[PDB]
Design a protein around this ligand. Structure first.
Ligand SMILES: Nc1ncnc2c1ncn2[C@@H]1O[C@H](COP(=O)(O)OP(=O)(O)O)[C@@H](O)[C@H]1O
Length: 258
DNA sequence: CCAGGGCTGATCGTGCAAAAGTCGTGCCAGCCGTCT
């Protein structure tokens, strides 16, 4: 029941809500999903579901479902008790076996390949996985949480991603709102970042913010968000490179040439 | 004076696979027994 807390940083009255919705499902062991756009602050949330569960005792391995080897998929996922180096006592590890009693994080689910998608399937609800070799398969108790920024329904129409896997996985999908829509925690997010930032670049103390600064930073549709705010602020700050006069200028894109 | 961290050394490991070798049986050439 212990709470990690970390950096909730939400003053949205909709991030509050976001925290509230996930909290109810934290105890739950059902498959879940997390959906975010290019700038959504979702990695913390996957941890905030498992951080808040009874099985908070469990290990929280989270694989990157996009980078696995096509060829080693069978081995990587399951693993083979015989290990290596002959009569060696060292046993093979495994993917799904190394997450019993703890939440498993799957990322880039939409991007995950057809071989991976078919391979998932059949292990999601059955609970039995058999390592290459042998005649015995052992049930694992593993909690599926999936984070994706891509739109699943469109993928289903295309046929690129199997429809059944998506349907079976996550009864409830958490909704994350874009930053242009928070619109409120920027005064707060922006300072927090900048405050960190001052010690990473080794300044003492923030100068302060011009009103204009805040006219620009409110006023913009912020394409691929949050992370975006950090970048707009972190650069702009190191840019300025001092602590006499307050911060006066922020650049949205360091592309434009001048 | 007692507990925590580092580091060295002590310990466990008789097989998998690649190429050379043998195996059995067939194909064909050359000698020899016998009838016409
Ligand atoms: N509520 C928050 N509190 C603190 N930091 C946040 C929050 N939301 C976003 N961030 C910052 O923005 C980044 C979000 O990246 P991430 O969630 O990994 O993107 P994605 O979910 O698209 O992979 C993090 O590195 C984090 O520092």
């Amino acid at each position: 029941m212990a709470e990690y807390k970390d950096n909730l940083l939400g003053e949205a009255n909709s991030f509050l809500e976001v925290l509230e919705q996930v909290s109810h499902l934290a105890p739950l062991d059902k498959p879940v999903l997390i959906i975010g756009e290019r700038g959504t602050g979702k990695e913390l949330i996957a941890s905030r579901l498992h951080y808040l569960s009874s099985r908070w005792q469990g290990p929280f391995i989270s694989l990157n479902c996009a980078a696995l080897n096509e060829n080693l998929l069978d081995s990587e996922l399951f693993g083979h008790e015989a290990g290596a180096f002959t009569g060696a006592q060292k046993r093979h590890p495994g993917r799904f076996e190394r997450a019993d009693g703890g939440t498993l994080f799957l990322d880039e689910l939409a991007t995950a390949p057809m071989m991976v998608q078919e391979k998932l399937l059949r292990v999601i609800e059955y609970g039995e996985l058999e390592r290459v070799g042998g005649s015995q398969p052992l049930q694992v108790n593993v909690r599926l949480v999936c984070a994706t920024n891509a739109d699943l329904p469109a993928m289903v129409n295309e046929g690129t991603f199997r429809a059944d896997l998506l349907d079976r996985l996550a009864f409830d999908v958490v909704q994350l709102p874009p930053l242009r829509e928070r619109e409120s925690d920027i005064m707060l997010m922006a300072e927090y970042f900048a405050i960190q930032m001052c010690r990473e670049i080794k300044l003492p103390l923030f100068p302060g913010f011009t009103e204009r600064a805040r006219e620009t930073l409110l006023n913009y549709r912020w394409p691929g968000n949050i992370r975006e705010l950090k970048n707009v602020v972190e650069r702009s700050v190191y840019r300025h490179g001092t602590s006499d006069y307050p911060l006066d200028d922020i650049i949205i894109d360091p592309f434009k040439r001048r």
